[PDB]
Design a protein around this ligand. Structure first.
Ligand SMILES: [Cl-]
Length: 283
């Protein structure tokens, strides 16, 4: 009986479907961060932000810990949220910002996805400089474009953030397991280089577990984002024996029930787990 056979797969899907359904947000749900005074918080009305793990009161963004792996998952910031988003990125000493929304999505003005990392700009008191750096192919034609974002604000320490932009991963799809591995390695390596610099400089952030977290977002911050975070957690040696059930349940209780949004995205996590001999189900 394979632990990765149709019966185990069906059981995993049944457990996760129950969890998605019971985590769906109620109106004024105490579990979810609420908008204040009419200003839009959630890019998508029913893709909400777990209050207990919210990063900032005015962002749809969550602290995520899968096993031992600590990240932030968020939605693509709204235009009104850009100053706060850049403050999140700077205060976190962000070692990598992985953006998985496509160039086509960002270009479509109907979607309200500001092009905040590929060009320079001013957002309230913050000035952001963008520089293009290397381009890395990930397989199957999927491409990572990298940037450095330098975040300035009078009186504040200047912070530069490495960005990994996958510009051609379409919404509601899963890139293959091989592409996912290549992406997770690139994001982890980018993060480790930048974290190492901070540690070399004696940054206080090194000792603060709310900081130095990779920040990942897509458009909603639940589909492409969750596939990448699940693959990153499987690269962390500390996460031996953490099951797929655990990793998806943790992302869901810590952000919302949509984390791992499409069956094809769950299937990639299952395939990566099987490759490691990692359990799918608890017990
Ligand atoms: Cl909560």
């Amino acid at each position: 009986v394979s632990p990765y056979g149709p019966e185990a797969r069906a059981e995993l899907s049944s457990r996760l479907t129950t969890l998605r359904n019971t985590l769906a947000p109620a109106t004024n749900d105490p579990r979810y961060l609420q908008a204040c005074g009419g200003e839009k918080l959630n890019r998508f009305r029913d893709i909400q932000c777990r209050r207990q793990t919210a990063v900032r009161a005015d962002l749809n963004a969550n602290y995520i810990q899968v096993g031992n792996t600590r990240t932030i998952a968020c939605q693509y910031p709204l235009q009104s949220q850009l100053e706060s988003h850049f403050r999140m990125l700077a205060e976190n000493r962000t070692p990598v910002l992985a953006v998985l929304a496509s160039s086509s999505e960002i270009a479509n003005q109907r979607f309200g996805m500001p092009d905040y990392f590929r060009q320079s700009g001013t957002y309230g008191s913050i000035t952001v400089e963008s520089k293009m750096t290397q381009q890395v192919g990930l397989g199957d034609g999927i491409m990572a474009d990298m940037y450095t974002l330098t975040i300035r604000e009078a009186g504040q320490k200047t912070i530069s953030v490495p960005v990994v932009h996958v510009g051609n991963w379409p919404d509601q799809t899963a890139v293959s397991s091989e592409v996912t591995k290549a992406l997770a390695s690139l994001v982890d390596q980018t993060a480790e280089t930048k974290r190492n610099m901070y540690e070399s400089k004696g940054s206080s952030a090194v000792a603060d577990d709310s900081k130095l977290r990779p920040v990942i977002h897509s458009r909603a911050g639940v589909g492409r984002t969750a596939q990448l975070i699940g693959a990153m957690c499987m690269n962390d040696s500390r996460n031996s024996q953490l099951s797929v059930e655990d990793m998806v349940s943790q992302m869901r209780v810590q952000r919302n029930g949509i984390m791992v949004q499409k069956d094809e995205q769950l299937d990639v996590l299952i395939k990566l787990a099987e490759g490691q001999g990692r359990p799918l189900l608890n017990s």
